[PDB]
Amino acid sequence: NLDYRDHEKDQMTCLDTLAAYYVQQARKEKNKDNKKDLITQATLLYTMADKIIMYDQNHLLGRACFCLLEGDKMDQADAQFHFVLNQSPNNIPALLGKACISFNKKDYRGALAYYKKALRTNPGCPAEVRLGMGHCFVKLNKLEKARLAFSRALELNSKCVGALVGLAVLELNNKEADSIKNGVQLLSRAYTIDPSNPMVLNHLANHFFFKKDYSKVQHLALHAFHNTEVEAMQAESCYQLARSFHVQEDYDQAFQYYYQATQFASSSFVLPFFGLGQMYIYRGDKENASQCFEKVLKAYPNNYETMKILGSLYAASEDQEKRDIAKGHLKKVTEQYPDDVEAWIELAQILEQTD
Amino acid sequence: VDVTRDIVSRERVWRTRTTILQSTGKNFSKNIFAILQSVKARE
């Protein structure tokens, strides 16, 4: 306000952009700046924005979104997002903030009811607000709903890869049917339009792994690893590298990748625990392969995991801590017939002390 | 010679002397030392 005759309102509207686009730009960081470099500028000017007008339609958005960037205080962010309904909720993303916090607490029922209001009004957003709804239609067995969400997102704008790689992930389960669409239309198209994505790089790597082309899996998994920040993608990017190294009789480099796959993200999937189980067999340190294979049964048993601890069975005699698991594993290979050849040997190798 | 470690490393001894002493079942001494101690107090 130099000579504008009481124009403080537009000044606060100006500083609101400097208190919201900083948090919006902190997520898509480049290679010369860090996260705190855009967080510290988002924390200073927000206090100066609240000197004129406090607690407005967007000022609570900053207090709520400050917690998503550090990964803590979820109840604080949900209680700050609810206030925009009680002050003046004149937009849809004024309410969409609660569903992202409901998603972080593993609440898809509370998130799906909030993502419905995003399509009725359908306000303006280049990010295809229908994409987060198609992302929650992934769970609770709504495959008829998530494709119908990704198709509209692909018809409004094909620039978005977030509506295309989902259909690739919706189609990765069919390995005998629809392979060309899954390696070309869902993997070669998402790659040429956006090569800096570690998801499509991981999926092109795991697709090339079955075709016995290991020259590109290790090349793409290095680029699928350095640009990601959250622990969900990096454990899998290290897991592809250690899987490509195990089949080459290269367990030295693959052991550290198998350790990083479990040290980064342990409750993600059963694959890193099984990889460390088959890896600890090396160098005669098969003691820890049992500890790492114990967590494989905790999710679900497998006909392939039963022979792992049976082969690496340290039970010898008068040792019921370890023979019960070999017996219970052998009871799994006894019914099924996956070309059993040595399965009956390990059966009788325990029953010599017993009947 | 190596014929010793060639055989003592692959064979299996399921039964030996001390095996013979314990029952194959589960007969602890809670039901044994009880009467064993009751006999000493009456004397």
Side-chain angles (χ1 to χ4, degrees), chain A residues 236-275:
Chain A
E236 294 296 322
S237 312
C238 310
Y239 167 74
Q240 279 294 319
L241 287 160
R243 178 88 284 154
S244 318
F245 292 148
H246 188 93
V247 306
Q248 292 161 352
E249 298 294 324
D250 193 11
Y251 68 107
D252 315 276
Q253 314 172 355
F255 158 62
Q256 313 165 342
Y257 275 119
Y258 284 150
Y259 178 65
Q260 295 155 354
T262 45
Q263 190 75 33
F264 291 149
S266 317
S267 288
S268 301
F269 202 55
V270 76
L271 263 185
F273 292 124
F274 155 72

mmCIF file of all heavy atoms in Angstrom, chain A residues 236-275:
data_model
loop_
_atom_site.group_PDB
_atom_site.id
_atom_site.type_symbol
_atom_site.label_atom_id
_atom_site.label_comp_id
_atom_site.label_asym_id
_atom_site.label_seq_id
_atom_site.Cartn_x
_atom_site.Cartn_y
_atom_site.Cartn_z
ATOM 1 N N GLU A 236 11.559 -51.531 -4.223
ATOM 2 C CA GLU A 236 11.293 -52.341 -5.398
ATOM 3 C C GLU A 236 12.321 -52.087 -6.488
ATOM 4 O O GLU A 236 12.675 -53.009 -7.236
ATOM 5 C CB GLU A 236 9.880 -52.056 -5.903
ATOM 6 C CG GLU A 236 8.781 -52.496 -4.947
ATOM 7 C CD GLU A 236 8.745 -53.994 -4.744
ATOM 8 O OE1 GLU A 236 8.980 -54.731 -5.725
ATOM 9 O OE2 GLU A 236 8.474 -54.436 -3.608
ATOM 10 N N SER A 237 12.839 -50.858 -6.570
ATOM 11 C CA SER A 237 13.873 -50.562 -7.565
ATOM 12 C C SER A 237 15.178 -51.269 -7.225
ATOM 13 O O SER A 237 15.899 -51.717 -8.123
ATOM 14 C CB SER A 237 14.073 -49.054 -7.677
ATOM 15 O OG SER A 237 12.832 -48.379 -7.800
ATOM 16 N N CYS A 238 15.500 -51.372 -5.928
ATOM 17 C CA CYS A 238 16.629 -52.204 -5.502
ATOM 18 C C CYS A 238 16.326 -53.690 -5.650
ATOM 19 O O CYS A 238 17.236 -54.485 -5.925
ATOM 20 C CB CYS A 238 17.001 -51.903 -4.051
ATOM 21 S SG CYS A 238 17.219 -50.180 -3.655
ATOM 22 N N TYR A 239 15.064 -54.086 -5.484
ATOM 23 C CA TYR A 239 14.732 -55.497 -5.632
ATOM 24 C C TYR A 239 14.880 -55.969 -7.070
ATOM 25 O O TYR A 239 15.340 -57.092 -7.301
ATOM 26 C CB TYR A 239 13.313 -55.759 -5.141
ATOM 27 C CG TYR A 239 12.801 -57.118 -5.553
ATOM 28 C CD1 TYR A 239 13.263 -58.275 -4.940
ATOM 29 C CD2 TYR A 239 11.875 -57.243 -6.582
ATOM 30 C CE1 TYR A 239 12.799 -59.512 -5.329
ATOM 31 C CE2 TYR A 239 11.412 -58.469 -6.977
ATOM 32 C CZ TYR A 239 11.871 -59.600 -6.350
ATOM 33 O OH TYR A 239 11.390 -60.821 -6.758
ATOM 34 N N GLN A 240 14.503 -55.145 -8.051
ATOM 35 C CA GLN A 240 14.756 -55.525 -9.446
ATOM 36 C C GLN A 240 16.241 -55.664 -9.735
ATOM 37 O O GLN A 240 16.647 -56.560 -10.490
ATOM 38 C CB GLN A 240 14.141 -54.511 -10.399
ATOM 39 C CG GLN A 240 12.677 -54.736 -10.590
ATOM 40 C CD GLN A 240 12.386 -56.051 -11.305
ATOM 41 O OE1 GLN A 240 13.072 -56.427 -12.257
ATOM 42 N NE2 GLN A 240 11.361 -56.754 -10.842
ATOM 43 N N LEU A 241 17.066 -54.809 -9.132
ATOM 44 C CA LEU A 241 18.497 -54.886 -9.394
ATOM 45 C C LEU A 241 19.091 -56.140 -8.798
ATOM 46 O O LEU A 241 19.921 -56.807 -9.422
ATOM 47 C CB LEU A 241 19.189 -53.650 -8.821
ATOM 48 C CG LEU A 241 18.909 -52.406 -9.654
ATOM 49 C CD1 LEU A 241 19.154 -51.099 -8.884
ATOM 50 C CD2 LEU A 241 19.726 -52.475 -10.942
ATOM 51 N N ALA A 242 18.651 -56.495 -7.599
ATOM 52 C CA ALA A 242 19.183 -57.703 -6.980
ATOM 53 C C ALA A 242 18.603 -58.959 -7.611
ATOM 54 O O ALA A 242 19.238 -60.021 -7.573
ATOM 55 C CB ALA A 242 18.938 -57.686 -5.496
ATOM 56 N N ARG A 243 17.407 -58.863 -8.208
ATOM 57 C CA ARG A 243 16.867 -59.997 -8.961
ATOM 58 C C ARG A 243 17.618 -60.198 -10.268
ATOM 59 O O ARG A 243 17.845 -61.335 -10.690
ATOM 60 C CB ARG A 243 15.369 -59.791 -9.230
ATOM 61 C CG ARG A 243 14.728 -60.916 -10.064
ATOM 62 C CD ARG A 243 14.220 -62.055 -9.200
ATOM 63 N NE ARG A 243 15.324 -62.880 -8.728
ATOM 64 C CZ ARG A 243 15.284 -63.598 -7.616
ATOM 65 N NH1 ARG A 243 14.188 -63.597 -6.874
ATOM 66 N NH2 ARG A 243 16.338 -64.312 -7.246
ATOM 67 N N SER A 244 18.012 -59.098 -10.918
ATOM 68 C CA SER A 244 18.824 -59.203 -12.124
ATOM 69 C C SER A 244 20.243 -59.664 -11.803
ATOM 70 O O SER A 244 20.908 -60.265 -12.653
ATOM 71 C CB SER A 244 18.846 -57.854 -12.849
ATOM 72 O OG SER A 244 17.559 -57.258 -12.851
ATOM 73 N N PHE A 245 20.723 -59.385 -10.589
ATOM 74 C CA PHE A 245 22.046 -59.847 -10.197
ATOM 75 C C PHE A 245 22.061 -61.283 -9.689
ATOM 76 O O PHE A 245 23.087 -61.955 -9.821
ATOM 77 C CB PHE A 245 22.618 -58.927 -9.122
ATOM 78 C CG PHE A 245 22.938 -57.565 -9.628
ATOM 79 C CD1 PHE A 245 22.837 -56.456 -8.807
ATOM 80 C CD2 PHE A 245 23.323 -57.391 -10.942
ATOM 81 C CE1 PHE A 245 23.126 -55.196 -9.298
ATOM 82 C CE2 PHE A 245 23.613 -56.140 -11.433
ATOM 83 C CZ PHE A 245 23.514 -55.041 -10.611
ATOM 84 N N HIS A 246 20.959 -61.780 -9.125
ATOM 85 C CA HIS A 246 20.965 -63.157 -8.644
ATOM 86 C C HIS A 246 21.025 -64.153 -9.801
ATOM 87 O O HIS A 246 21.763 -65.143 -9.730
ATOM 88 C CB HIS A 246 19.736 -63.413 -7.770
ATOM 89 C CG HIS A 246 19.751 -64.737 -7.067
ATOM 90 N ND1 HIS A 246 20.241 -64.898 -5.789
ATOM 91 C CD2 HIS A 246 19.327 -65.961 -7.463
ATOM 92 C CE1 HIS A 246 20.119 -66.163 -5.428
ATOM 93 N NE2 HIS A 246 19.568 -66.830 -6.427
ATOM 94 N N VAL A 247 20.293 -63.893 -10.890
ATOM 95 C CA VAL A 247 20.260 -64.833 -12.013
ATOM 96 C C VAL A 247 21.558 -64.858 -12.796
ATOM 97 O O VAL A 247 21.741 -65.734 -13.650
ATOM 98 C CB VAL A 247 19.134 -64.506 -13.011
ATOM 99 C CG1 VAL A 247 17.801 -64.410 -12.295
ATOM 100 C CG2 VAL A 247 19.444 -63.222 -13.757
ATOM 101 N N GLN A 248 22.466 -63.925 -12.529
ATOM 102 C CA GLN A 248 23.758 -63.875 -13.192
ATOM 103 C C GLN A 248 24.863 -64.442 -12.319
ATOM 104 O O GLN A 248 26.042 -64.175 -12.570
ATOM 105 C CB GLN A 248 24.076 -62.435 -13.592
ATOM 106 C CG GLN A 248 23.163 -61.927 -14.686
ATOM 107 C CD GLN A 248 23.131 -60.423 -14.772
ATOM 108 O OE1 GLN A 248 23.679 -59.731 -13.916
ATOM 109 N NE2 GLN A 248 22.462 -59.905 -15.794
ATOM 110 N N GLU A 249 24.501 -65.229 -11.305
ATOM 111 C CA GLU A 249 25.448 -65.686 -10.294
ATOM 112 C C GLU A 249 26.227 -64.503 -9.733
ATOM 113 O O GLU A 249 27.449 -64.546 -9.565
ATOM 114 C CB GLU A 249 26.380 -66.766 -10.840
ATOM 115 C CG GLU A 249 25.658 -68.024 -11.289
ATOM 116 C CD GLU A 249 25.009 -68.770 -10.129
ATOM 117 O OE1 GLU A 249 25.598 -68.790 -9.029
ATOM 118 O OE2 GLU A 249 23.909 -69.335 -10.317
ATOM 119 N N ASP A 250 25.497 -63.434 -9.435
ATOM 120 C CA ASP A 250 26.057 -62.241 -8.819
ATOM 121 C C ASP A 250 25.230 -61.957 -7.570
ATOM 122 O O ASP A 250 24.328 -61.121 -7.553
ATOM 123 C CB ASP A 250 26.036 -61.075 -9.800
ATOM 124 C CG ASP A 250 26.877 -59.929 -9.341
ATOM 125 O OD1 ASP A 250 27.641 -60.090 -8.369
ATOM 126 O OD2 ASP A 250 26.784 -58.862 -9.972
ATOM 127 N N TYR A 251 25.570 -62.672 -6.498
ATOM 128 C CA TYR A 251 24.901 -62.552 -5.218
ATOM 129 C C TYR A 251 25.582 -61.554 -4.297
ATOM 130 O O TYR A 251 24.966 -61.110 -3.319
ATOM 131 C CB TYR A 251 24.831 -63.933 -4.548
ATOM 132 C CG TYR A 251 26.178 -64.471 -4.113
ATOM 133 C CD1 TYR A 251 26.536 -64.515 -2.771
ATOM 134 C CD2 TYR A 251 27.091 -64.950 -5.050
ATOM 135 C CE1 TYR A 251 27.768 -65.010 -2.378
ATOM 136 C CE2 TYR A 251 28.324 -65.439 -4.665
ATOM 137 C CZ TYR A 251 28.657 -65.468 -3.333
ATOM 138 O OH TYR A 251 29.884 -65.960 -2.962
ATOM 139 N N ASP A 252 26.813 -61.158 -4.601
ATOM 140 C CA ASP A 252 27.511 -60.213 -3.743
ATOM 141 C C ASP A 252 26.853 -58.845 -3.820
ATOM 142 O O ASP A 252 26.534 -58.236 -2.794
ATOM 143 C CB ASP A 252 28.983 -60.144 -4.147
ATOM 144 C CG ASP A 252 29.583 -61.521 -4.371
ATOM 145 O OD1 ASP A 252 30.000 -62.157 -3.381
ATOM 146 O OD2 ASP A 252 29.623 -61.975 -5.534
ATOM 147 N N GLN A 253 26.608 -58.369 -5.036
ATOM 148 C CA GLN A 253 25.944 -57.091 -5.221
ATOM 149 C C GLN A 253 24.457 -57.172 -4.925
ATOM 150 O O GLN A 253 23.865 -56.174 -4.499
ATOM 151 C CB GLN A 253 26.148 -56.621 -6.655
ATOM 152 C CG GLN A 253 27.580 -56.752 -7.126
ATOM 153 C CD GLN A 253 27.714 -56.465 -8.600
ATOM 154 O OE1 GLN A 253 26.717 -56.248 -9.291
ATOM 155 N NE2 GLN A 253 28.943 -56.499 -9.106
ATOM 156 N N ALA A 254 23.849 -58.337 -5.139
ATOM 157 C CA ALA A 254 22.425 -58.501 -4.907
ATOM 158 C C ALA A 254 22.086 -58.657 -3.432
ATOM 159 O O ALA A 254 20.947 -58.381 -3.045
ATOM 160 C CB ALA A 254 21.906 -59.707 -5.690
ATOM 161 N N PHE A 255 23.045 -59.062 -2.595
ATOM 162 C CA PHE A 255 22.744 -59.202 -1.176
ATOM 163 C C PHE A 255 22.484 -57.851 -0.534
ATOM 164 O O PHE A 255 21.564 -57.708 0.278
ATOM 165 C CB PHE A 255 23.882 -59.914 -0.452
ATOM 166 C CG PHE A 255 23.921 -59.641 1.028
ATOM 167 C CD1 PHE A 255 22.866 -60.008 1.848
ATOM 168 C CD2 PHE A 255 25.031 -59.045 1.607
ATOM 169 C CE1 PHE A 255 22.904 -59.755 3.212
ATOM 170 C CE2 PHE A 255 25.074 -58.800 2.971
ATOM 171 C CZ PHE A 255 24.010 -59.156 3.772
ATOM 172 N N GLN A 256 23.275 -56.848 -0.898
ATOM 173 C CA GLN A 256 23.105 -55.532 -0.303
ATOM 174 C C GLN A 256 21.829 -54.875 -0.801
ATOM 175 O O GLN A 256 21.160 -54.162 -0.043
ATOM 176 C CB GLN A 256 24.334 -54.682 -0.606
ATOM 177 C CG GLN A 256 25.643 -55.421 -0.326
ATOM 178 C CD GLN A 256 26.855 -54.748 -0.949
ATOM 179 O OE1 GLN A 256 26.726 -53.929 -1.856
ATOM 180 N NE2 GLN A 256 28.043 -55.101 -0.468
ATOM 181 N N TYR A 257 21.449 -55.146 -2.049
ATOM 182 C CA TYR A 257 20.172 -54.669 -2.561
ATOM 183 C C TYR A 257 19.001 -55.370 -1.889
ATOM 184 O O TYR A 257 17.979 -54.735 -1.608
ATOM 185 C CB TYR A 257 20.086 -54.912 -4.064
ATOM 186 C CG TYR A 257 20.683 -53.870 -4.968
ATOM 187 C CD1 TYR A 257 21.728 -54.183 -5.822
ATOM 188 C CD2 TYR A 257 20.148 -52.601 -5.025
ATOM 189 C CE1 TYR A 257 22.253 -53.239 -6.674
ATOM 190 C CE2 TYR A 257 20.660 -51.652 -5.869
ATOM 191 C CZ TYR A 257 21.712 -51.972 -6.696
ATOM 192 O OH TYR A 257 22.221 -51.011 -7.541
ATOM 193 N N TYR A 258 19.132 -56.669 -1.612
ATOM 194 C CA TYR A 258 18.089 -57.369 -0.871
ATOM 195 C C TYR A 258 17.991 -56.851 0.555
ATOM 196 O O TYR A 258 16.897 -56.811 1.125
ATOM 197 C CB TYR A 258 18.353 -58.879 -0.866
ATOM 198 C CG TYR A 258 18.042 -59.607 -2.163
ATOM 199 C CD1 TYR A 258 18.765 -60.738 -2.525
ATOM 200 C CD2 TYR A 258 17.079 -59.137 -3.039
ATOM 201 C CE1 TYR A 258 18.507 -61.401 -3.711
ATOM 202 C CE2 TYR A 258 16.813 -59.809 -4.232
ATOM 203 C CZ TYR A 258 17.532 -60.940 -4.553
ATOM 204 O OH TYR A 258 17.309 -61.621 -5.725
ATOM 205 N N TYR A 259 19.119 -56.451 1.146
ATOM 206 C CA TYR A 259 19.055 -55.872 2.480
ATOM 207 C C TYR A 259 18.409 -54.498 2.455
ATOM 208 O O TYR A 259 17.620 -54.175 3.345
ATOM 209 C CB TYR A 259 20.443 -55.768 3.097
ATOM 210 C CG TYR A 259 20.420 -55.124 4.466
ATOM 211 C CD1 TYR A 259 19.770 -55.744 5.528
ATOM 212 C CD2 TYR A 259 21.037 -53.902 4.698
ATOM 213 C CE1 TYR A 259 19.739 -55.168 6.786
ATOM 214 C CE2 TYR A 259 21.015 -53.316 5.956
ATOM 215 C CZ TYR A 259 20.364 -53.954 6.998
ATOM 216 O OH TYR A 259 20.332 -53.380 8.254
ATOM 217 N N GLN A 260 18.710 -53.692 1.438
ATOM 218 C CA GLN A 260 18.099 -52.376 1.329
ATOM 219 C C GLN A 260 16.609 -52.454 1.013
ATOM 220 O O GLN A 260 15.851 -51.571 1.428
ATOM 221 C CB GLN A 260 18.811 -51.582 0.242
ATOM 222 C CG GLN A 260 20.251 -51.272 0.560
ATOM 223 C CD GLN A 260 21.060 -51.063 -0.699
ATOM 224 O OE1 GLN A 260 20.555 -51.253 -1.807
ATOM 225 N NE2 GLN A 260 22.319 -50.667 -0.540
ATOM 226 N N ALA A 261 16.178 -53.505 0.310
ATOM 227 C CA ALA A 261 14.764 -53.674 0.004
ATOM 228 C C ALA A 261 13.940 -53.903 1.267
ATOM 229 O O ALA A 261 12.787 -53.463 1.341
ATOM 230 C CB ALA A 261 14.585 -54.838 -0.970
ATOM 231 N N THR A 262 14.516 -54.563 2.269
ATOM 232 C CA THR A 262 13.832 -54.757 3.539
ATOM 233 C C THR A 262 14.110 -53.648 4.544
ATOM 234 O O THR A 262 13.267 -53.398 5.415
ATOM 235 C CB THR A 262 14.244 -56.087 4.166
ATOM 236 O OG1 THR A 262 15.666 -56.221 4.073
ATOM 237 C CG2 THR A 262 13.548 -57.261 3.466
ATOM 238 N N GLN A 263 15.255 -52.972 4.442
ATOM 239 C CA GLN A 263 15.572 -51.883 5.358
ATOM 240 C C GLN A 263 14.808 -50.613 5.015
ATOM 241 O O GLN A 263 14.491 -49.818 5.909
ATOM 242 C CB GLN A 263 17.076 -51.614 5.330
ATOM 243 C CG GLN A 263 17.547 -50.684 6.412
ATOM 244 C CD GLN A 263 17.595 -51.345 7.774
ATOM 245 O OE1 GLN A 263 17.861 -52.541 7.894
ATOM 246 N NE2 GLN A 263 17.339 -50.563 8.812
ATOM 247 N N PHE A 264 14.506 -50.414 3.733
ATOM 248 C CA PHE A 264 13.731 -49.256 3.312
ATOM 249 C C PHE A 264 12.253 -49.446 3.623
ATOM 250 O O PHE A 264 11.662 -48.677 4.390
ATOM 251 C CB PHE A 264 13.939 -49.020 1.818
ATOM 252 C CG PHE A 264 15.315 -48.548 1.474
ATOM 253 C CD1 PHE A 264 15.899 -48.881 0.262
ATOM 254 C CD2 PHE A 264 16.036 -47.787 2.374
ATOM 255 C CE1 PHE A 264 17.169 -48.453 -0.048
ATOM 256 C CE2 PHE A 264 17.302 -47.352 2.071
ATOM 257 C CZ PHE A 264 17.873 -47.687 0.856
ATOM 258 N N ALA A 265 11.641 -50.473 3.041
ATOM 259 C CA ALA A 265 10.205 -50.707 3.172
ATOM 260 C C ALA A 265 9.988 -52.188 3.462
ATOM 261 O O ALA A 265 10.121 -53.030 2.568
ATOM 262 C CB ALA A 265 9.466 -50.265 1.916
ATOM 263 N N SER A 266 9.661 -52.505 4.716
ATOM 264 C CA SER A 266 9.527 -53.893 5.141
ATOM 265 C C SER A 266 8.093 -54.408 5.034
ATOM 266 O O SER A 266 7.872 -55.537 4.584
ATOM 267 C CB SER A 266 10.034 -54.043 6.576
ATOM 268 O OG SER A 266 11.245 -53.326 6.756
ATOM 269 N N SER A 267 7.111 -53.598 5.422
ATOM 270 C CA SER A 267 5.716 -54.004 5.380
ATOM 271 C C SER A 267 5.075 -53.749 4.022
ATOM 272 O O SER A 267 3.845 -53.662 3.934
ATOM 273 C CB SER A 267 4.925 -53.288 6.478
ATOM 274 O OG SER A 267 5.250 -53.792 7.761
ATOM 275 N N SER A 268 5.879 -53.628 2.964
ATOM 276 C CA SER A 268 5.330 -53.388 1.634
ATOM 277 C C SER A 268 4.813 -54.676 1.011
ATOM 278 O O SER A 268 3.620 -54.802 0.720
ATOM 279 C CB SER A 268 6.387 -52.747 0.735
ATOM 280 O OG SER A 268 6.835 -51.527 1.287
ATOM 281 N N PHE A 269 5.696 -55.648 0.813
ATOM 282 C CA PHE A 269 5.310 -56.904 0.186
ATOM 283 C C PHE A 269 6.192 -58.021 0.726
ATOM 284 O O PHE A 269 7.146 -57.787 1.472
ATOM 285 C CB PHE A 269 5.405 -56.818 -1.341
ATOM 286 C CG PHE A 269 4.558 -57.834 -2.060
ATOM 287 C CD1 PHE A 269 3.199 -57.928 -1.803
ATOM 288 C CD2 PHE A 269 5.122 -58.698 -2.983
ATOM 289 C CE1 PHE A 269 2.419 -58.865 -2.459
ATOM 290 C CE2 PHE A 269 4.345 -59.632 -3.640
ATOM 291 C CZ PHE A 269 2.993 -59.717 -3.380
ATOM 292 N N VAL A 270 5.849 -59.251 0.330
ATOM 293 C CA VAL A 270 6.569 -60.437 0.784
ATOM 294 C C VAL A 270 7.818 -60.716 -0.036
ATOM 295 O O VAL A 270 8.643 -61.546 0.364
ATOM 296 C CB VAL A 270 5.618 -61.648 0.745
ATOM 297 C CG1 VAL A 270 5.417 -62.122 -0.682
ATOM 298 C CG2 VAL A 270 6.119 -62.772 1.646
ATOM 299 N N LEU A 271 7.992 -60.035 -1.166
ATOM 300 C CA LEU A 271 9.122 -60.337 -2.039
ATOM 301 C C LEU A 271 10.488 -60.081 -1.402
ATOM 302 O O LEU A 271 11.363 -60.954 -1.536
ATOM 303 C CB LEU A 271 8.980 -59.552 -3.350
ATOM 304 C CG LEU A 271 8.353 -60.315 -4.517
ATOM 305 C CD1 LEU A 271 8.368 -59.482 -5.787
ATOM 306 C CD2 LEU A 271 9.081 -61.623 -4.719
ATOM 307 N N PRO A 272 10.751 -58.949 -0.732
ATOM 308 C CA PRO A 272 12.107 -58.732 -0.193
ATOM 309 C C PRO A 272 12.490 -59.714 0.904
ATOM 310 O O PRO A 272 13.667 -60.088 1.006
ATOM 311 C CB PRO A 272 12.048 -57.292 0.339
ATOM 312 C CG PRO A 272 10.881 -56.667 -0.336
ATOM 313 C CD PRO A 272 9.892 -57.773 -0.500
ATOM 314 N N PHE A 273 11.521 -60.163 1.712
ATOM 315 C CA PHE A 273 11.810 -61.161 2.739
ATOM 316 C C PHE A 273 12.196 -62.493 2.120
ATOM 317 O O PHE A 273 13.109 -63.167 2.611
ATOM 318 C CB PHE A 273 10.597 -61.364 3.646
ATOM 319 C CG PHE A 273 10.273 -60.184 4.510
ATOM 320 C CD1 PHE A 273 9.014 -59.608 4.466
ATOM 321 C CD2 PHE A 273 11.218 -59.644 5.361
ATOM 322 C CE1 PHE A 273 8.702 -58.519 5.260
ATOM 323 C CE2 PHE A 273 10.908 -58.556 6.156
ATOM 324 C CZ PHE A 273 9.649 -57.994 6.104
ATOM 325 N N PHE A 274 11.538 -62.873 1.023
ATOM 326 C CA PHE A 274 11.875 -64.119 0.345
ATOM 327 C C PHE A 274 13.190 -64.004 -0.411
ATOM 328 O O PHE A 274 13.947 -64.980 -0.506
ATOM 329 C CB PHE A 274 10.741 -64.520 -0.600
ATOM 330 C CG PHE A 274 11.178 -65.385 -1.747
ATOM 331 C CD1 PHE A 274 11.542 -66.705 -1.549
ATOM 332 C CD2 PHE A 274 11.209 -64.874 -3.032
ATOM 333 C CE1 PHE A 274 11.934 -67.498 -2.619
ATOM 334 C CE2 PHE A 274 11.603 -65.658 -4.100
ATOM 335 C CZ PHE A 274 11.966 -66.970 -3.895
ATOM 336 N N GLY A 275 13.488 -62.819 -0.943
ATOM 337 C CA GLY A 275 14.771 -62.630 -1.590
ATOM 338 C C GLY A 275 15.925 -62.706 -0.614
ATOM 339 O O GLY A 275 16.957 -63.310 -0.919
#
